[PDB]
Scaffold this active site. Structure first.
Site, PDB file in Angstrom:
ATOM      1  N   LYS A  29      54.503  26.490  41.486  1.00  0.00           N
ATOM      2  CA  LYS A  29      55.330  25.455  40.876  1.00  0.00           C
ATOM      3  C   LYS A  29      54.665  24.851  39.639  1.00  0.00           C
ATOM      4  O   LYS A  29      53.439  24.798  39.523  1.00  0.00           O
ATOM      5  CB  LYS A  29      55.651  24.350  41.890  1.00  0.00           C
ATOM      6  CG  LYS A  29      56.431  24.852  43.101  1.00  0.00           C
ATOM      7  CD  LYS A  29      56.669  23.783  44.171  1.00  0.00           C
ATOM      8  CE  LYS A  29      57.145  24.425  45.491  1.00  0.00           C
ATOM      9  NZ  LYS A  29      58.540  24.053  45.892  1.00  0.00           N
ATOM     10  N   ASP A 141      55.630  41.122  28.978  1.00  0.00           N
ATOM     11  CA  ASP A 141      56.716  40.427  29.638  1.00  0.00           C
ATOM     12  C   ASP A 141      57.398  39.530  28.617  1.00  0.00           C
ATOM     13  O   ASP A 141      57.626  38.338  28.839  1.00  0.00           O
ATOM     14  CB  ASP A 141      56.195  39.657  30.849  1.00  0.00           C
ATOM     15  CG  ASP A 141      57.297  39.258  31.786  1.00  0.00           C
ATOM     16  OD1 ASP A 141      58.378  39.888  31.714  1.00  0.00           O
ATOM     17  OD2 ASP A 141      57.084  38.319  32.586  1.00  0.00           O
TER      18      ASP A 141
END
Ligand SMILES: Nc1ncnc2c1ncn2[C@@H]1O[C@H](COP(=O)(O)OP(=O)(O)O)[C@@H](O)[C@H]1O
Length: 280
Positions: A29, A141
């Site tokens: 997170k 990515d």
């Protein structure tokens, strides 16, 4: 590179309050925080130290970013591995990802010139990865969620977990030639360009077959002379013909089947800046 005590990370995030959660990535997170008595806003990512994947991305992110400094790369401020933790501390990017200003969002649509300037910014950051470090860095990515926007809308490349010296963005030539080329970033960046123009996901697995992958559908529409029909409706009539043509040809070159045929990021960056000029 700075190291933070685990207590400083709790202070920054009001003790991991979920008021301060921005999102969750596969690393863990992410929390908004402030350090240095509130002068510096930060994004803080908590990984899990018992994830082998997580620890690899953690050291990769730290190994990479501690040697890079560039206007269009997200800065890593520091990290915390105290208590067998995996915490990364970055500059806060107040306007989120590029993706959340393109579609599936309640944010206002972006003017064409700011879209172009966001893609030039990202292209500059990618160009620095390929030419400005000791060795070429392959981001691996590149996607619209990995281009972040700061308070002044400066585009910044992030997420260096898979960097070496996502569906729809993957270089199809990887599954065939099996090499590492920075032309694989060029391919992904070309999909990003098509996303900025057409404001739709790079992969929509619900569509007709020819349209599933933006990387294939947009070149096909351009050849057929109908790329105008899948352009973002907010952009209809806002792009001059010379900018449209130069922008689309540049994206098309980036998603060529063979990496050797693709342009360098330097060439791409120059062609986008040329497009921005042809827009005026
Ligand atoms: N460095 C950052 N600065 C500001 N916000 C960030 C940063 N990294 C991630 N975010 C926030 O997280 C979301 C996009 O990244 P996210 O998927 O949550 O984390 P990750 O990039 O690790 O996958 C957005 O809501 C964005 O505001």
């Amino acid at each position: 590179c700075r190291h933070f005590a685990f207590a400083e990370i709790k202070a920054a995030t009001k003790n991991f309050d979920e008021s301060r959660v921005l999102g969750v990535g596969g690393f863990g997170k992410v929390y908004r925080g402030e350090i240095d008595g509130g002068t510096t806003k930060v994004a803080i990512k908590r990984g899990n130290p018992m994830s082998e994947q997580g620890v690899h991305e953690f050291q990769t992110e730290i190994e990479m970013l501690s040697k890079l400094r560039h206007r269009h790369l997200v800065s890593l401020i520091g990290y915390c591995e105290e208590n067998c933790e995996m915490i990364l501390v970055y500059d806060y990017m107040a306007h989120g990802t590029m993706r959340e200003h393109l579609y599936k969002t309640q944010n206002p649509s972006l003017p064409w010139k700011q879209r172009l300037e966001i893609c030039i910014g990202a292209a500059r950051g990618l160009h620095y990865l390929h030419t400005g470090a000791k060795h070429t860095i392959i981001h691996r990515d590149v996607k619209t969620t990995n281009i972040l926007l700061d308070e002044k809308w400066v585009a910044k490349v992030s997420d260096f977990g898979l960097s070496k010296t996502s569906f729809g963005y993957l270089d199809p030539e990887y599954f065939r030639r099996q090499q590492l080329t920075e032309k694989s970033d060029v391919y992904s960046f070309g999909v990003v360009l098509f996303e900025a123009l057409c404001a739709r996901p790079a992969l929509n697995p619900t569509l007709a077959k020819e349209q599933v992958s933006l990387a294939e559908w947009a070149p096909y529409c351009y050849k057929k002379g109908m790329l105008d029909q899948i352009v973002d409706p907010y952009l209809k009539g806002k792009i001059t013909p010379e900018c449209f043509k130069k922008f689309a040809e540049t994206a098309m070159k980036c998603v060529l089947d063979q990496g050797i045929e693709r342009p360098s990021m330097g060439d791409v960056l120059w062609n986008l800046e040329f497009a921005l000029q042809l827009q005026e």
